[PDB]
Design an enzyme around this catalytic site. Structure first.
Site, mmCIF file in Angstrom:
data_model
loop_
_atom_site.group_PDB
_atom_site.id
_atom_site.type_symbol
_atom_site.label_atom_id
_atom_site.label_comp_id
_atom_site.label_asym_id
_atom_site.label_seq_id
_atom_site.Cartn_x
_atom_site.Cartn_y
_atom_site.Cartn_z
ATOM 1 N N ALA A 120 -26.948 -40.466 24.028
ATOM 2 C CA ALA A 120 -26.205 -41.469 24.770
ATOM 3 C C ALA A 120 -25.987 -40.969 26.190
ATOM 4 O O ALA A 120 -25.918 -39.765 26.437
ATOM 5 C CB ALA A 120 -24.863 -41.779 24.097
ATOM 6 N N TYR A 152 -11.917 -34.542 43.544
ATOM 7 C CA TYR A 152 -13.304 -34.238 43.850
ATOM 8 C C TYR A 152 -14.197 -35.082 42.961
ATOM 9 O O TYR A 152 -13.800 -35.474 41.862
ATOM 10 C CB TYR A 152 -13.591 -32.751 43.632
ATOM 11 N N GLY A 208 -37.815 -26.791 27.735
ATOM 12 C CA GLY A 208 -38.445 -28.086 27.633
ATOM 13 C C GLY A 208 -37.639 -29.063 26.812
ATOM 14 O O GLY A 208 -38.191 -29.966 26.176
ATOM 15 N N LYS A 219 -26.017 -49.148 26.378
ATOM 16 C CA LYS A 219 -24.686 -48.622 26.115
ATOM 17 C C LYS A 219 -23.776 -49.194 27.186
ATOM 18 O O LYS A 219 -23.912 -48.844 28.361
ATOM 19 C CB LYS A 219 -24.661 -47.098 26.152
ATOM 20 N N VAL A 236 -29.988 -33.150 19.732
ATOM 21 C CA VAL A 236 -29.018 -34.211 19.914
ATOM 22 C C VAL A 236 -28.990 -34.555 21.399
ATOM 23 O O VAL A 236 -29.736 -33.982 22.196
ATOM 24 C CB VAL A 236 -27.625 -33.811 19.393
ATOM 25 N N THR A 277 -21.480 -36.948 28.507
ATOM 26 C CA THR A 277 -21.604 -36.483 29.882
ATOM 27 C C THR A 277 -22.658 -35.401 30.075
ATOM 28 O O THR A 277 -22.906 -35.016 31.220
ATOM 29 C CB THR A 277 -20.246 -35.975 30.386
HETATM 30 C C1 FAD Z 1 -23.520 -31.811 19.352
HETATM 31 C C2 FAD Z 1 -23.954 -32.231 20.731
HETATM 32 C C3 FAD Z 1 -23.940 -33.584 21.065
HETATM 33 C C4 FAD Z 1 -24.346 -34.012 22.319
HETATM 34 N N1 FAD Z 1 -24.323 -35.377 22.620
HETATM 35 C C5 FAD Z 1 -24.681 -35.739 23.822
HETATM 36 C C6 FAD Z 1 -24.618 -37.144 24.164
HETATM 37 O O1 FAD Z 1 -24.254 -38.048 23.421
HETATM 38 N N2 FAD Z 1 -25.027 -37.427 25.460
HETATM 39 C C7 FAD Z 1 -25.466 -36.511 26.384
HETATM 40 O O2 FAD Z 1 -25.768 -36.911 27.510
HETATM 41 N N3 FAD Z 1 -25.518 -35.187 26.051
HETATM 42 C C8 FAD Z 1 -25.142 -34.836 24.835
HETATM 43 N N4 FAD Z 1 -25.148 -33.514 24.520
HETATM 44 C C9 FAD Z 1 -25.680 -32.591 25.487
HETATM 45 C C10 FAD Z 1 -27.194 -32.574 25.411
HETATM 46 O O3 FAD Z 1 -27.644 -32.059 24.156
HETATM 47 C C11 FAD Z 1 -27.741 -31.780 26.586
HETATM 48 O O4 FAD Z 1 -27.080 -32.360 27.706
HETATM 49 C C12 FAD Z 1 -29.244 -32.004 26.690
HETATM 50 O O5 FAD Z 1 -29.809 -32.195 25.390
HETATM 51 C C13 FAD Z 1 -29.954 -30.899 27.440
HETATM 52 O O6 FAD Z 1 -30.159 -29.770 26.565
HETATM 53 P P1 FAD Z 1 -30.926 -28.496 27.101
HETATM 54 O O7 FAD Z 1 -32.308 -29.005 27.507
HETATM 55 O O8 FAD Z 1 -30.108 -27.889 28.161
HETATM 56 O O9 FAD Z 1 -31.043 -27.498 25.877
HETATM 57 P P2 FAD Z 1 -31.987 -27.457 24.602
HETATM 58 O O10 FAD Z 1 -32.217 -28.809 24.083
HETATM 59 O O11 FAD Z 1 -31.431 -26.358 23.723
HETATM 60 O O12 FAD Z 1 -33.376 -26.994 25.143
HETATM 61 C C14 FAD Z 1 -33.591 -25.624 25.522
HETATM 62 C C15 FAD Z 1 -35.053 -25.455 25.777
HETATM 63 O O13 FAD Z 1 -35.280 -24.101 26.216
HETATM 64 C C16 FAD Z 1 -36.338 -23.565 25.453
HETATM 65 N N5 FAD Z 1 -36.229 -22.118 25.413
HETATM 66 C C17 FAD Z 1 -35.186 -21.330 25.004
HETATM 67 N N6 FAD Z 1 -35.432 -20.044 25.073
HETATM 68 C C18 FAD Z 1 -36.737 -19.987 25.537
HETATM 69 C C19 FAD Z 1 -37.592 -18.912 25.834
HETATM 70 N N7 FAD Z 1 -37.253 -17.630 25.681
HETATM 71 N N8 FAD Z 1 -38.825 -19.206 26.290
HETATM 72 C C20 FAD Z 1 -39.174 -20.485 26.442
HETATM 73 N N9 FAD Z 1 -38.455 -21.584 26.197
HETATM 74 C C21 FAD Z 1 -37.238 -21.258 25.749
HETATM 75 C C22 FAD Z 1 -36.237 -24.247 24.098
HETATM 76 O O14 FAD Z 1 -37.479 -24.117 23.416
HETATM 77 C C23 FAD Z 1 -35.955 -25.675 24.561
HETATM 78 O O15 FAD Z 1 -37.155 -26.299 24.995
HETATM 79 C C24 FAD Z 1 -24.799 -33.066 23.239
HETATM 80 C C25 FAD Z 1 -24.828 -31.714 22.918
HETATM 81 C C26 FAD Z 1 -24.414 -31.288 21.664
HETATM 82 C C27 FAD Z 1 -24.473 -29.818 21.327
#
Ligand code: FAD
Ligand code: FAD
Lengths: 498, 503
Positions: free
Chosen positions: B46, B438, B9, B74, B43, B346
């Site tokens: 952007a 690509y 989520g 942006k 995080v 990205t």
């Molecule tokens: C330092 C940093 C800077 C970034 N800056 C940017 C930026 O400027 N722009 C951009 O577009 N992207 C950026 N990104 C990338 C961005 O963070 C991701 O693209 C975006 O936040 C999606 O994250 P996620 O949902 O995949 O993972 P997460 O935010 O880690 O979410 C994972 C989810 O899975 C859930 N989960 C995990 N295990 C379980 C389980 N067993 N059961 C149930 N739920 C579970 C967690 O509770 C959470 O809800 C950045 C990333 C990092 C690390």
């Protein structure tokens, strides 16, 4: 101060001279040497979606050149009898819309309005069926080649090849191109294998920084003098011969490609005549029989017209730019004119000559490498596209048409065809380098030819189709309106001349 | 009828749920399961030139969601101190014109108006320097992702990540998405290696036609349960760590700059993302060159006293991509699929592209599904591999070489195809013929901006320009200069623009 010597005064030579004149003005020295004895190929009368860039680059309006070249509009290729007898479809020069992230071809496969994908999805289809001009009598239509091909209606032209060459001759000579009528009788090479000069019979030796080989199939400079190998495409495209005729109601705004027992016949309508030809594979029929089929197809007006028999060199030079010599036109390569790409290859080549024009110093090998990659990609991509015409044609009535399904297909195309059975062609599955053909072109051929079953995307079962129905309705409404309002080409060009 | 279970989520899970809702409505059954205990990454604030497609696909207007997410515009990334101390340049979200068949960058190399390619060639550069909104107070600007990126000004957004997630939660749940707050504790496989169900702590076992792994770096389904190998990108991009802060500020004190800032540091770079009521900021760094403690100290010093008592969010990044992102009945979206450092923001682009491609390659359950999965995997692999090349170019072309870290950017592994491109780019500015062929969301002008801005690789203009008439090119440079000077005098600040939006 660079000097360019163009050897050859066919369409390739004078397109090159005129284009370079438009690009560089008097800042580059241009000479065309062309033989009075050696004729041009005598055909090449339909063009492709690139072509409006050429005339606009020369800063020419349609009224400047079309009447002088007996030119007409080409909005599409009309393919007759490829799927089955009596069937026709178009590859139109018109972008295909996407609705909610899926191309109209996908929506059409799921919910066709009529049995004709081309009629349902492109307005130009109705203009061609109706035989009307794409421009109103007030002149209104209904910077790189690629950008011009991205226009909503990137239409093309039919014209008399000899008249265009004569027109471009005047254009280039009036703007500083030196015109030598003479034979090149020797190509002298220096110690590093570059051309030092071309020797003429009566005008001495011509030196240049760049020699453009526009000598046609013979490839006097690139193939003969420099020995650059030629790569045959005949494994995949066996058509190797043609017989052509010039033979003196609304003029249909398209080229017609009518499939035959051993190839296909083109019909190119001009202002005062029809250019026509039977492209065929000599392993399956004789020159005598092909000429008979052509004259019979045209009918009694073709009785005593002289036939122009042509053996085609089908393929491409391994590299088109070698040392200080670049081949432009038939010297560089050729594929059968099923999509009228020969002048496109020339036009692309000369745009790239300007783009990769050498300094004489550092970087010139890299520029030549990029040039060669770009022209090789265009020809290899078009070859794939042409192969798809035969590989997807439904007709299988004789050995020739059966063999289209068993002969060599480029391996990458074979893989694309397997994907296309479940995802209509798009940017992800089309030959990925520029070759002048956006994905809608592949859709038109694949669906029109009818020999490969294509499934719509499973997502469309759950996507709301309201927007797609609205887009099909918009196209239908626009097409039926345009057909009632547009003039015929006859009326349009009568007023242009007036 | 078809069932999709989204595990996670964070931004990835709710972007997936909301996008599928917009694509399929109630005709596909959607469930998001997300842990109350496992937080999101915290995080990701952007976005990239794709992003306006996302909100328009959801049929949202800017006034619908921007105030609720404290969002700002942006228009570019501002790169500070990459070429040399005190220097900045932009990668703007604005098409670069071509004149007489040559890109403006080529003409600029031959005849620069000023020393700043970005200022001479893009209007958005002046808007960012001036700190103004791209839209007038009357709202006026000055179907696929690719088509949206082809817009004249394919601008993007900053927003509070958690507020966007909450907004999208409401959007998707009000349109039928089942929302389970729970932990997935087991992923059960059938005999053929497909996911049979996911077991939750308190909501039983969930079955689906398609499981979307949005579990973040842990990749619970794709990498753990299905064992899909992960391919590291660390040979070419050594930054492996980040420390982030959310810093409340009186953002009404001064004009909000309409860009992300990427300020090069001794062992990486610091992002500044301005929002309506705070700044998101972080130091992306290579753990081999500095410690977490030193990185946090550098970040706090950079931010200044407003960071006092603000907690630091230390992040270990998984840099690379899954070998395949769609395996059997499981597709990874977000950090589970891959990640490269946020130098060009990205990550959400990867999510957005992924979910567009999920819709595009949505399976039937029958024949053709293996080919659809193959096409999906190729598409997302090309996006990530192409963006990798683009990011490597930032470091490879950066002029600064003041310490071991920045010296090492010139000796480190470069993908072989990029090394060949760089040799061509020394004599032909990037264009379609020489960039990664690509789709990867980056038109050639982006490469030109980085190559010329970073300043570390000498680039020659095309020899043809010595003989081409430059009248049209001078006219285009003048048109851009005139337009930019007019716009900066007329446009409101973002502060004024969004104050009126809230009103
Ligand atoms: C330092 C940093 C800077 C970034 N800056 C940017 C930026 O400027 N722009 C951009 O577009 N992207 C950026 N990104 C990338 C961005 O963070 C991701 O693209 C975006 O936040 C999606 O994250 P996620 O949902 O995949 O993972 P997460 O935010 O880690 O979410 C994972 C989810 O899975 C859930 N989960 C995990 N295990 C379980 C389980 N067993 N059961 C149930 N739920 C579970 C967690 O509770 C959470 O809800 C950045 C990333 C990092 C690390
Ligand atoms: C059957 C057929 C159908 C075609 N249909 C189309 C079509 O529909 N659309 C299209 O765009 N293209 C078409 N093409 C391709 C088109 O004909 C060529 O792309 C175009 O005409 C350019 O030809 P060329 O100038 O390269 O060669 P040529 O026309 O052969 O010209 C060669 C020139 O070199 C000169 N030359 C040769 N040797 C010497 C020498 N030693 N010294 C001096 N001068 C010399 C000759 O005198 C002549 O001027 C077709 C081709 C064929 C064969």
């Amino acid at each position: 101060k660079k000097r360019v010597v163009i050897v050859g005064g066919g369409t390739a030579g004078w397109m090159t001279a005129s284009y370079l004149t438009a690009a560089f003005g008097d800042r580059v020295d241009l000479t065309v040497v062309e033989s009075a004895q050696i004729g041009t190929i005598g055909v090449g009368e339909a063009t492709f979606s690139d072509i409006r860039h050429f005339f606009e680059f020369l800063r020419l309006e349609e009224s400047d050149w079309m009447p002088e070249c007996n030119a007409t509009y080409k909005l599409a290729v009309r393919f007759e009898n490829w799927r089955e007898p009596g069937h026709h479809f178009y590859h139109p020069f018109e972008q295909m819309s996407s609705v909610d992230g899926f191309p109209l071809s996908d929506w059409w496969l799921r919910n066709p309005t009529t049995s004709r994908f081309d009629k349902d999805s492109f307005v130009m289809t109705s203009l061609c069926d109706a035989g009307v001009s794409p421009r109103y009598l007030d002149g209104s239509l209904i910077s790189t080649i690629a950008e011009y091909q991205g226009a909503q209606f990137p239409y093309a032209y039919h014209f008399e090849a000899h008249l265009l060459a004569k027109y471009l001759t005047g254009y280039a000579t009036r703007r500083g191109t030196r015109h030598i009528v003479d034979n090149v009788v020797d190509v002298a090479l220096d110690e590093r294998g570059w051309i030092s000069h071309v020797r003429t019979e009566e005008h001495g030796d011509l030196e240049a920084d760049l020699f453009v080989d526009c000598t046609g199939f013979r490839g006097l400079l690139l193939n003969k003098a420099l020995g650059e190998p030629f790569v045959s495409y005949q494994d995949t495209l066996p058509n190797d011969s043609a017989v052509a005729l010039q033979v003196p109601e609304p003029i249909r705004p398209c080229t017609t490609a009518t499939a035959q027992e051993a190839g296909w016949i083109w019909t190119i309508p001009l202002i005062s005549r029809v250019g026509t030809g039977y492209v065929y594979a000599s392993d399956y029929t004789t020159p005598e029989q092909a000429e008979r089929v052509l004259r019979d197809f045209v009918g009694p007006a073709a009785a005593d017209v002289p036939a122009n028999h042509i053996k085609m060199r089908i393929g491409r030079s391994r590299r088109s730019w070698v040392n200080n010599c670049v081949g432009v036109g038939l010297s560089s390569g050729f594929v059968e004119p099923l999509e009228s790409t020969g002048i496109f290859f020339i036009h692309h080549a000369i745009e790239q000559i300007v783009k990769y024009f050498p300094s004489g110093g550092a970087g010139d090998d890299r520029l030549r490498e990029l040039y060669n990659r770009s022209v090789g990609h265009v020809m290899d991509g078009v070859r794939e596209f042409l192969v798809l015409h035969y590989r997807s044609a439904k007709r299988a009535d004789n050995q020739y048409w059966k063999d289209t399904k068993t002969r060599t297909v480029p391996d990458s195309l074979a893989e694309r065809i397997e994907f296309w059975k479940h995802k209509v062609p798009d940017a992800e599955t089309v030959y990925p380098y520029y070759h002048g053909l956006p994905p809608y072109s592949y859709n038109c051929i694949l669906l029109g030819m009818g020999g490969i079953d294509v499934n719509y995307s499973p997502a469309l079962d759950w996507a709301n189709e309201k927007a797609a129905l609205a887009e099909f309705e918009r196209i239908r409404v626009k097409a039926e309106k345009l057909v009632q309002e547009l003039p015929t080409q006859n009326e349009y060009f009568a007023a242009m001349r007036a």
